[PDB]
Design a protein around this ligand. Structure first.
Ligand code: HEC
Ligand code: HEM
Ligand code: HEM
Ligand SMILES: Cc1nc(CO)c(-c2ccc(Oc3cccc(OC(F)(F)F)c3)cc2)c(O)c1Cl
Lengths: 57, 370, 239, 32, 65, 98, 74
């Protein structure tokens, strides 16, 4: 079986599980997406932000 | 058990041939809730007094935890409101929905409710255009004989705008959207006796379908693009539409050189500005809106739509230009190159409606023998 | 007679994800204090708004301890002066507008809190205002106190030239030329009328990478349901 | 009559996993 | 001590649109100054020079700063 | 010359590109609901199917191929006898009231 | 009002399929884009020309406005 079908019969079949899945993924997703944009935002504005001038003072 | 009313919103019969235009008819349900939701939290900090109001705005834009957003989700949200209307109102013209006579007239009273609401919503923060924008619009009612000076003084709580006239709006303004929230339910009730009105114009009773899976998600999709095209403004260009002057405190002893209310009046403001006379231009304004009630007595073609009337198509989108002109021509000052256009364009507005759109169906009936 | 449109200058923040060079905010604040704050009543800001942007807690608090502020009803029933604290807004120059008009040629400095967003072009205007003082042209005569600058409407302003090369000196020691001053100040003023610029772009960015990611999936979920009826053949089979 | 009826072919529209009428479903269904 | 700006204005006054408008300015300048009683001025022509100038100052100046 | 224009307008209105006819698209009112009630079965169902597919194709924004389109000479005026019959009765019903 | 007494149908047949048994976006590029054009050619003529003329009155309206502020030879 593909990952998809293995994914279906484990999680996406029983609705009680299907809601348990989403908060789990969301709970971890919050931990990645913030780190991503905060770094990209840091990266694009390299040499401008407070944390980049946080050591001098 | 009252859930069964949501047969209206769950198991409703509606067509299948439906565009994404009619999403706009639904977004106002979101904009109306979205605006109140924002504006409510917003108004936990506003103050209905002069000396503190403009500060009481900046109390939000600076010190409040994410209070700065709520001003702009509200303000520019009030503009994405209209952008749905003037696609939603132009619709029924182009698809012949005004025939639902019991409904189209309701479609007026919602509008006039808003165009007297949104006005009140611009003046609360005293942006130096608030005041004069309140003065220019409100003073026009003085044009009336024998009561003009009395009403305007009566609504000016005296002799001109002041602390009292602020507070007379913040309560008139924080209330009406609920009156819209109610009348909107009426606007749907008369519909539910007949259902929607397809682009063709034909009774599609043979091909009506549910609403919970299909148009729901479509409306969400419609809603998703709205929030997108609302987040862009607030996030990337909140200064775009709202004139910059509205951040200046208000002072009756200093006018700006150029004055214009917010952009959306301008199709109508320009009409008044064209007429050098005072009163005789006003009654064009109120008639520039109430004419929509006059249309259903001018449905000539024994067809309904304009999908099947290529001549009227040439005249319909033409009207959109004249609006997009009058939207802009009012936005610019009073000088000779433009005044010559307002005297034309404003006449074109009345002209296309009351002469030629009937004239098309008078012809198109005859090209096809009825 | 004419207006004047400033050009579209580049900046460290003109991009749709370009934030402010907070360093450039730092030296700009020195300019407001040495120069502007004798006549510009910026009221809608306090030193505590400078924390986490250009200075620290202690360094900013040092500046409130610097200037005295009117505060307190004494138990004797009077008012006194104390060193400022963070919660106090900027020391206003003059108690009212009139004294500012009397301490000038009848004209009034506008506040700089929201001047940038309250003036067409904002920074480009304000930068090109200071850096557009020039000798008058032919045929023009101007009263006393006034001066010439095209960008200001009417081309007649009661603005004494406030900036000149090495009117002051900054801390890190950059070249205190008339331009580098004008950048850091105009960079400052945008922050005054936008304490949210840094965070505006963050949610400015987080939006797309949700909506750009969602909006197709919804556009599939739409097409997932409608596909029953996007694919439907009919017929007509009477006797 | 009701025997002369026939269903058209949506093979221009189906998923690839099911185009082969000789096969069965239920091996890609769980994936679909 | 020198302003970096004046270096750039100097380089730009050599440019095409800058020089041409400068020439018209002098002709306005003499047309008025040679006349006695005129409600006229070179506020007209000065602006066409500057917007032509500052467009060059725009494109590059913050390479230095 | 005229008749070269009726045939053209009928091609520009679009409603030959959807398997429809002319009477199909009429605004429905009380005067017309009478006639559509009065039609016979063989023609009535033939009204339905012309509509029922044009809708589903105004859904997709697709059309029929050029062959299956409608032709001006074949634009049958099947409804006019049944309709003018009505408005005769209407004006007989009104003027008799005056 | 609801399903059940709307109107009459006789001798019509409907063929409809699950979504699961079919791709969501079949021939999205192939058949759509020609259909975008055909959709476009049938509207463009009676949609633009007003907006085309607007571009000219937004054009001449500003140019003729600019001149009027420039002085005259006098
Ligand atoms: C001499 C006291 C004083 C100084 C010092 C001073 N200002 Fe001014 N400012 C004024 C006055 C007086 C006006 C009135 C201008 C007018 O009435 O048009 C003004 C006007 C302004 C304006 C309004 C622009 C407009 O459109 O009217 C701005 C912006 C401004 N100043 C910024 C600055 C900056 C930047 C500096 C430092 C480089 C500065 N000011 C220093 C007194 C001052
Ligand atoms: C259709 C309904 C409404 C319209 C068209 C409208 C219009 C406006 C507009 C255009 C502004 C702009 C002010 C700015 O951008 O600075 C504004 C601000 C404001 N709105 Fe309204 N409004 C509406 C309903 C409401 C509601 C429902 C509330 C509260 C629940 C509200 C409370 C306020 C307040 C207190 C302000 C002052 C904030 C400010 O000026 O920025 N308004 N309104
Ligand atoms: C807050 C304001 C409004 C709300 C909440 C609202 C809501 C709706 C909704 C949900 C629909 C059904 C969707 C649709 O038919 O496209 C609708 C339809 C309609 N609306 Fe609006 N509307 C508002 C304002 C207006 C206005 C200003 C008009 C002006 C004429 C108007 C006229 C109509 C008409 C004629 C229809 C006919 C529906 C059809 O043709 O099928 N409505 N309205
Ligand atoms: C054809 C059609 N019909 C209807 C209702 O008959 C709707 C429709 C469906 C649901 C509606 O309910 C809502 C939802 C949110 C706000 C709203 O405002 C409110 F609540 F009245 F203020 C109404 C309102 C209208 C629709 O979206 C379409 Cl497309």
């Amino acid at each position: 079986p593909t990952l998809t079908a293995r994914l279906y019969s484990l999680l996406f079949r029983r609705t009680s599980t299907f809601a348990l899945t989403i908060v789990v993924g969301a709970l971890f997703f919050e931990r990645a997406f913030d780190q991503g944009a905060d770094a990209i935002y840091e990266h694009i504005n390299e040499g401008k932000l407070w944390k980049h001038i946080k050591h001098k003072y | 058990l009252m859930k069964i009313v949501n047969n209206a919103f769950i198991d409703l019969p509606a067509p299948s041939n439906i565009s994404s235009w009619w999403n706009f008819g639904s977004l106002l349900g979101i904009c109306l809730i979205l605006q109140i939701l924002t504006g409510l939290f917003l108004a936990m900090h506003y103050t209905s007094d002069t000396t503190t109001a403009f500060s009481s705005v900046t109390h939000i834009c600076r010190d409040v935890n994410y209070g700065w957003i709520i001003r702009y989700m509200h303000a520019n949200g009030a503009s994405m409101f209209f952008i749905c209307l003037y696609m939603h109102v132009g619709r029924g013209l182009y698809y012949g929905s005004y025939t639902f006579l019991e409904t189209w007239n309701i479609g007026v009273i919602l509008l006039l409710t808003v165009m007297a609401t949104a006005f009140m919503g611009y003046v609360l923060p005293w942006g130096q255009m608030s005041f004069w924008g309140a003065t220019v619009i409100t003073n026009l009612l003085s044009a009336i004989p024998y009561i003009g000076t009395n009403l305007v003084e009566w609504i000016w709580g005296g002799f001109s705008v002041d602390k009292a006239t602020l507070t007379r709006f913040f309560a008139f303004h924080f209330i009406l959207p609920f009156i819209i929230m109610a009348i909107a339910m009426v606007h749907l009730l008369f519909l539910h006796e007949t259902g929607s009105n397809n682009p063709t114009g034909i009774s599609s009773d043979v091909d009506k379908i549910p609403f919970h899976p299909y148009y729901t998600i479509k409306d969400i999709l419609g809603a998703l693009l709205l929030i997108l095209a609302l987040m862009l403004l607030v996030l990337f260009a909140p200064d775009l539409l709202g004139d910059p002057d509205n951040y200046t405190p208000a002072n009756p002893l200093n006018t700006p050189p150029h004055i214009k209310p917010e952009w959306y009046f301008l199709f109508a403001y320009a009409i008044l500005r064209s007429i050098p006379n005072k009163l005789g231009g006003v009654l064009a304004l109120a008639f520039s809106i109430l004419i929509l009630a006059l249309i259903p007595l001018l449905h000539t073609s024994k067809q309904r739509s304009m999908m099947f009337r290529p001549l009227s198509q040439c005249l319909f989108w033409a009207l959109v230009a004249d609006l997009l002109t009058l939207t802009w021509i009012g936005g610019q000052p009073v000088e000779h190159p433009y005044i010559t256009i307002g005297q034309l364009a404003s006449v074109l507005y009345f002209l296309l409606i009351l002469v030629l759109m009937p004239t098309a169906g008078t012809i198109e009936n005859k090209l096809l023998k009825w | 007679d004419l207006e004047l449109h400033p050009p579209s200058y580049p900046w460290s923040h003109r991009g749709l994800l370009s934030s402010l060079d907070h360093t450039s905010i730092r030296r700009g604040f020195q300019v407001y204090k040495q120069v502007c704050s004798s006549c510009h009543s910026m009221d809608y800001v306090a030193y505590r708004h400078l924390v986490g942007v250009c200075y620290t807690e202690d360094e900013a608090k040092a500046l409130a301890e610097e200037v005295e502020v009117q505060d307190g009803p004494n138990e004797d029933g009077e008012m006194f002066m104390r060193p400022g604290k963070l919660s106090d807004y900027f020391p206003k120059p003059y108690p009212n507008p009139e004294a500012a008009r009397a301490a000038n040629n009848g004209a009034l400095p506008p506040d700089l809190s929201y001047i940038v967003r309250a003036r067409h072009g904002g920074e480009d205007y304000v930068f090109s205002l200071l850096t557009g003082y020039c000798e008058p042209p032919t045929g023009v005569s101007l009263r006393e106190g006034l001066y010439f600058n095209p960008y200001f409407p009417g081309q007649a302003i009661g603005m004494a030239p406030p900036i000149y090369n090495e009117v002051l000196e900054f801390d890190d020691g950059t070249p205190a030329t008339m331009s580098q001053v004008a950048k850091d100040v105009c960079t400052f003023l945008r922050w005054a009328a936008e304490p949210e610029h840094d965070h505006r772009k963050r949610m400015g960015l987080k939006m797309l990478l949700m909506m750009g990611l969602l909006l197709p999936l919804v556009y599939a979920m739409k097409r997932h349901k409608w596909s029953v009826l996007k694919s439907r053949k009919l017929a007509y089979r009477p006797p | 009559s009701h025997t002369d009826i026939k269903v058209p072919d949506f093979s221009d529209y189906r998923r690839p996993e099911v185009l082969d009428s000789t096969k069965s479903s239920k091996e890609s269904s769980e994936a679909r | 001590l020198v302003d970096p700006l004046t270096t750039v204005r100097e380089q730009c006054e050599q440019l095409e649109k800058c020089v041409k408008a400068r020439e018209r300015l002098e002709l306005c300048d003499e047309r008025v100054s040679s006349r006695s009683q005129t409600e006229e001025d070179c506020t007209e022509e000065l602006l066409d020079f500057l917007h032509a100038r500052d467009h060059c100052v725009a494109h590059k100046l913050f390479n230095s700063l | 010359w005229l008749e070269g224009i009726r045939k053209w307008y009928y091609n520009a209105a679009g409603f030959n590109k959807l398997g429809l006819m002319r009477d199909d698209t009429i605004h429905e009112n009380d005067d017309v609901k009478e006639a559509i009630r009065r039609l016979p079965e063989n023609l009535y169902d033939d009204r339905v199917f012309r509509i029922k597919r044009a809708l589903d194709l105004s859904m997709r924004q697709q059309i029929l191929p050029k062959e299956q389109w409608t032709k001006y000479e074949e634009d049958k005026s099947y409804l006019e006898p049944y309709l003018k019959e009505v408005i005769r009765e209407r004006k007989e019903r009104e003027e008799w009231a005056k | 009002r609801q399903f059940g007494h709307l109107t009459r149908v006789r001798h019509v047949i409907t063929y409809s399929l699950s979504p699961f048994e079919q791709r969501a976006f079949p021939h999205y590029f192939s058949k759509g884009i020609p259909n975008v054009l055909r959709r476009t050619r049938a509207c463009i003529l009676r949609v633009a020309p007003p907006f085309v003329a607007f571009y000219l009155v937004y054009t001449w309206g500003t140019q003729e406005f600019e001149k009027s502020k420039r002085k005259n030879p006098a």
